[PDB]
Every structure is written in C-alpha cells, then in structure tokens.
Enzyme design. Structure first.
Site, PDB file in Angstrom:
ATOM      1  N   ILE A   1      -0.955   0.298  11.867  1.00 58.81           N
ATOM      2  CA  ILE A   1      -1.774   0.949  10.838  1.00 58.81           C
ATOM      3  C   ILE A   1      -1.727   0.263   9.476  1.00 58.81           C
ATOM      4  O   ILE A   1      -2.371   0.719   8.525  1.00 58.81           O
ATOM      5  CB  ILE A   1      -1.479   2.455  10.694  1.00 58.81           C
TER       6      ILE A   1
ATOM      7  N   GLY B   1       3.581  -2.965   4.959  1.00 59.88           N
ATOM      8  CA  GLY B   1       4.237  -2.554   3.719  1.00 59.88           C
ATOM      9  C   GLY B   1       4.784  -3.715   2.898  1.00 59.88           C
ATOM     10  O   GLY B   1       5.806  -3.556   2.230  1.00 59.88           O
ATOM     11  N   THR B   2       4.088  -4.857   2.935  1.00 61.34           N
ATOM     12  CA  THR B   2       4.457  -6.127   2.253  1.00 61.34           C
ATOM     13  C   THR B   2       5.809  -6.750   2.650  1.00 61.34           C
ATOM     14  O   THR B   2       5.889  -7.949   2.938  1.00 61.34           O
ATOM     15  CB  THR B   2       4.310  -6.082   0.687  1.00 61.34           C
ATOM     16  N   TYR B   3       6.871  -5.951   2.661  1.00 65.63           N
ATOM     17  CA  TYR B   3       8.043  -6.267   3.476  1.00 65.63           C
ATOM     18  C   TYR B   3       7.692  -6.104   4.959  1.00 65.63           C
ATOM     19  O   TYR B   3       7.561  -7.101   5.680  1.00 65.63           O
ATOM     20  CB  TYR B   3       9.216  -5.363   3.088  1.00 65.63           C
TER      21      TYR B   3
ATOM     22  N   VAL C   1       3.860  -1.607   9.563  1.00 60.86           N
ATOM     23  CA  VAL C   1       3.867  -0.156   9.849  1.00 60.86           C
ATOM     24  C   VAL C   1       2.999   0.218  11.069  1.00 60.86           C
ATOM     25  O   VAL C   1       1.845  -0.175  11.148  1.00 60.86           O
ATOM     26  CB  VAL C   1       3.385   0.692   8.652  1.00 60.86           C
TER      27      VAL C   1
ATOM     28  N   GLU D   1       6.748  10.894   8.119  1.00 59.36           N
ATOM     29  CA  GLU D   1       5.646  11.730   8.578  1.00 59.36           C
ATOM     30  C   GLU D   1       4.388  10.850   8.612  1.00 59.36           C
ATOM     31  O   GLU D   1       4.221   9.982   7.767  1.00 59.36           O
ATOM     32  CB  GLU D   1       5.453  12.920   7.634  1.00 59.36           C
TER      33      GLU D   1
ATOM     34  N   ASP E   1      -5.526   6.523   4.697  1.00 57.91           N
ATOM     35  CA  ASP E   1      -5.285   6.159   3.310  1.00 57.91           C
ATOM     36  C   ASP E   1      -6.506   6.447   2.427  1.00 57.91           C
ATOM     37  O   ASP E   1      -7.558   6.936   2.881  1.00 57.91           O
ATOM     38  CB  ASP E   1      -4.757   4.712   3.187  1.00 57.91           C
TER      39      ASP E   1
ATOM     40  N   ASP F   1       4.172  -0.288  -7.093  1.00 58.03           N
ATOM     41  CA  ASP F   1       3.024  -0.913  -6.436  1.00 58.03           C
ATOM     42  C   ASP F   1       1.998   0.092  -5.910  1.00 58.03           C
ATOM     43  O   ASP F   1       1.579   0.029  -4.750  1.00 58.03           O
ATOM     44  CB  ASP F   1       3.502  -1.845  -5.322  1.00 58.03           C
TER      45      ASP F   1
ATOM     46  N   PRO G   1      -4.693   2.152  -3.583  1.00 61.83           N
ATOM     47  CA  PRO G   1      -5.333   3.079  -2.620  1.00 61.83           C
ATOM     48  C   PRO G   1      -4.762   3.052  -1.203  1.00 61.83           C
ATOM     49  O   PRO G   1      -4.863   4.044  -0.470  1.00 61.83           O
ATOM     50  CB  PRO G   1      -6.803   2.599  -2.579  1.00 61.83           C
TER      51      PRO G   1
HETATM   52  C1  LIG Z   1       0.661   2.714   6.078  1.00 58.89           C
HETATM   53  C2  LIG Z   1       2.076   3.003   5.569  1.00 58.89           C
HETATM   54  C3  LIG Z   1       2.742   4.229   5.738  1.00 58.89           C
HETATM   55  C4  LIG Z   1       2.212   5.404   6.296  1.00 58.89           C
HETATM   56  C5  LIG Z   1       2.967   6.577   6.249  1.00 58.89           C
HETATM   57  C6  LIG Z   1       2.412   7.749   6.730  1.00 58.89           C
HETATM   58  N1  LIG Z   1       1.179   7.742   7.212  1.00 58.89           N
HETATM   59  C7  LIG Z   1       0.440   6.618   7.276  1.00 58.89           C
HETATM   60  N2  LIG Z   1      -0.804   6.747   7.775  1.00 58.89           N
HETATM   61  C8  LIG Z   1      -1.781   5.821   7.798  1.00 58.89           C
HETATM   62  C9  LIG Z   1      -1.789   4.684   7.003  1.00 58.89           C
HETATM   63  C10 LIG Z   1      -2.824   3.744   7.103  1.00 58.89           C
HETATM   64  C11 LIG Z   1      -3.885   3.933   7.991  1.00 58.89           C
HETATM   65  N3  LIG Z   1      -4.953   3.011   8.055  1.00 58.89           N
HETATM   66  C12 LIG Z   1      -6.047   3.261   9.015  1.00 58.89           C
HETATM   67  C13 LIG Z   1      -6.947   2.050   9.323  1.00 58.89           C
HETATM   68  N4  LIG Z   1      -6.548   0.844   8.581  1.00 58.89           N
HETATM   69  C14 LIG Z   1      -6.382   1.199   7.179  1.00 58.89           C
HETATM   70  C15 LIG Z   1      -5.059   1.953   7.036  1.00 58.89           C
HETATM   71  C16 LIG Z   1      -3.884   5.062   8.806  1.00 58.89           C
HETATM   72  C17 LIG Z   1      -2.828   5.976   8.711  1.00 58.89           C
HETATM   73  N5  LIG Z   1       0.950   5.475   6.767  1.00 58.89           N
HETATM   74  S1  LIG Z   1       4.300   4.038   5.033  1.00 58.89           S
HETATM   75  C18 LIG Z   1       4.010   2.445   4.538  1.00 58.89           C
HETATM   76  O1  LIG Z   1       4.817   1.708   3.977  1.00 58.89           O
HETATM   77  N6  LIG Z   1       2.789   2.069   4.926  1.00 58.89           N
HETATM   78  C19 LIG Z   1       2.266   0.699   4.657  1.00 58.89           C
END
Ligand SMILES: Cc1c(-c2ccnc(/N=C3\C=CC(N4CCNCC4)=CC3)n2)sc(=O)n1C
Length: 296
Positions: free
Chosen positions: A10, A13-15, A18, A79, A84, A125, A128
């Site tokens: 999804i 996180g630059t490091y 996810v 969770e 986003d 950081d 959106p």
């Molecule tokens: C995405 C993300 C975290 C996270 C935590 C909880 N929920 C989510 N949920 C989504 C985050 C991103 C996402 N995307 C859907 C399609 N591509 C764009 C991003 C769908 C769900 N992300 S924690 C973190 O460091 N990151 C980068």
C-alpha cells in the site's frame, strides 16, 4: 513475520515498505511496516525510540498496534485505514472537497499535532500520503517518530523521489534544531492544497522548493525573519522576489481561513501559529464533522 499474511503493497514509509496484511491468528487486518535496516541488526537507541511511540495514542494518530523486533528485524503493525488523503484529493479534484470537510480535517489534524507537540514529538514529514482517512470522517497522522529514530535516505529503497512540497523553509535553509513549527507549515501547505486542488509549492529539488516559496511569499529577509541571513544555506545572492497577496494564493477561501493560513505560513517559526492556538481561531467557530463520500 509468520503471524501475518501480506495482502498488498500500500505504500513506502521512506525507510520502510508498508503492506496491507491479515493477522493469521486474530483475523484483524492491519498496515504492516517493515523497516529497512541500516544493517548497522537494529540500533538499540532506535528500539526505545519506537517504544515511546506505542504510548503516543490519539484519535487522530494512526494507532501503532505492536512493534515486533524479532531475529534481525523490526516491523511496525498499525491499525489499517482504508485510504490516504492523497487519493481522496485525487478523487475530489473535479468538484473540490466541501469546505466543511476541509475544515473538519484541518481541525482534527491540529488536534493531533497539538497532542504530539505537547509531548515534544514532531512529525517532520506531513503530506497527503501520511494522512489516512476513514468512512466516519476521521483523519489521522501516520508515518512518524520513525524519522527521529533512524536517518532516511532520499532515494529510499523503492527508488521514488522524496517529496519536498511540504517542507518548511527553516529545514530547507539547513537548520538542525527546528521546532514543532515545521509541522504547522506542512499542514498549511496541505490546507491550501485541499482548498485550491493544486499543490502550493511543488518543487522538485531543494532550491526549486525554496524559490517557489520565495516567489509566492516574498524572498525572506531580516525584517520578516530575523536571523534568516545567518542560516547555513541562506545566500545573499538569492533572487529577491516580492510577496503575493494571499487573495491570489488560495481563492476563494474566506477571510478567516486565509488569515489562519497566513499565520501557518509565517516565515519565522517563532511567529508561526501553534497548533493549540490555531484551534481557537475564528475559522473553526462553525466547525462540524461531516461524512466523506469515499471510494472503497
Ligand atoms: C501507508 C502507511 C501506513 C498506513 C497505516 C494505516 N493504514 C494505511 N492505509 C493505507 C495507506 C495507503 C493506501 N494507498 C492506496 C493506493 N495507493 C495509495 C496509497 C491505502 C491504505 N496505511 S503507516 C506508513 O508508514 N505508511 C506509509
């Protein structure tokens, strides 16, 4: 870990990378972050730094569910929220996010930030992509406290570039010991972006980022930003652009919102409004919590 089945990538996180993942025991679906190790296993410093984050819980902070430091590795289990803010902005570009929902989101995030900052935690950081939304009208901060604990490469693991658009100018001018005010800046930029449906300062290197800021807000000088000229990357040779009026920057935002934003975007981080004080701003006198029209 073996306790988790990866359902999909999804993000980064630059490091870390996810994933949406399913806890094979507890059925819960979660966001699983696997942190790219400096390979320098895991500094012990970093572990106790992440520990603190497990206690920094707030309705507007994405809940860190577990840290799993086992064998080599460090995973963060959050969770899962279903999208986003970037995707909602994208989805909303033709019609624009309703202002009452802009306001609710701004408000909520200011509450998140007021809470963090009251505990001397900075996000550092905001963008959106690090703001996650649910169907009930919540918006939550994510992907932070990470960056204190280790230092992040700019090309990262995935080879995508780091976004500068939301960077405060003190960071850009090379300050090390910058403040909670950096997050207020980043949030002002997002605020503008929600309102206009265009990114305020979409720079593509540090100097482009800084000159984009100068172009719109005026080249900073000692009158508006006492001390600015002694900062590490400040050059007397910066082109000297004049300030735009905010009326050109975020139409057709109303005077309260515009006034709020201009205080969020004050050059001097000391004159920049705090999250706490921003909450008391007249712009939120009519604040509500509307339901987003999402596309899950
Ligand atoms: C995405 C993300 C975290 C996270 C935590 C909880 N929920 C989510 N949920 C989504 C985050 C991103 C996402 N995307 C859907 C399609 N591509 C764009 C991003 C769908 C769900 N992300 S924690 C973190 O460091 N990151 C980068």
């Amino acid at each position: 870990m073996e306790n988790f089945q990866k359902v999909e990538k999804i993000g980064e996180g630059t490091y870390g990378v996810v994933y949406k993942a399913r806890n094979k025991l507890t059925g819960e679906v979660v966001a699983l972050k696997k942190i790219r190790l400096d390979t320098e296993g895991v500094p012990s410093t970093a572990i106790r730094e992440i520990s603190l984050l497990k206690e920094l819980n707030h309705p507007n902070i994405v809940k860190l569910l577990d840290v799993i430091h086992t064998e080599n590795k460090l995973y963060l289990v959050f969770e899962f929220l279903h999208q986003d803010l970037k995707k909602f902005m994208d989805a909303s570009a033709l019609t624009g996010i309703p202002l009452p929902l802009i306001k609710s989101y701004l408000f909520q995030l200011l509450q998140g930030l007021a809470f963090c900052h009251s505990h001397r935690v900075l996000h550092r950081d905001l963008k959106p992509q690090n703001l996650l939304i649910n169907t009930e009208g919540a918006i939550k901060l994510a992907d932070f406290g990470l960056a204190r604990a280790f230092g992040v490469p700019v090309r990262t693991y995935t080879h995508e570039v780091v976004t500068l658009w939301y960077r405060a100018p003190e960071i850009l001018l090379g300050c090390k010991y910058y403040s909670t005010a950096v997050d207020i800046w980043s949030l002002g930029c997002i605020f503008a972006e929600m309102v206009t449906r265009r990114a305020l300062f979409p720079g593509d290197s540090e100097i482009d980022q800084l000159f984009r800021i100068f172009r719109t807000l005026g080249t900073p000088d000692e009158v508006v930003w006492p001390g600015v000229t002694s900062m590490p990357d400040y050059k007397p040779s910066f082109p000297k652009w004049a300030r735009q009026d905010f009326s050109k920057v975020v139409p057709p935002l109303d005077e309260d919102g515009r006034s709020l934003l201009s205080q969020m975007l004050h050059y001097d981080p000391n004159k920049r409004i705090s999250a706490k004080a921003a909450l008391a701003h007249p712009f939120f006198q009519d604040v509500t919590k509307p339901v987003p029209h999402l596309r899950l």
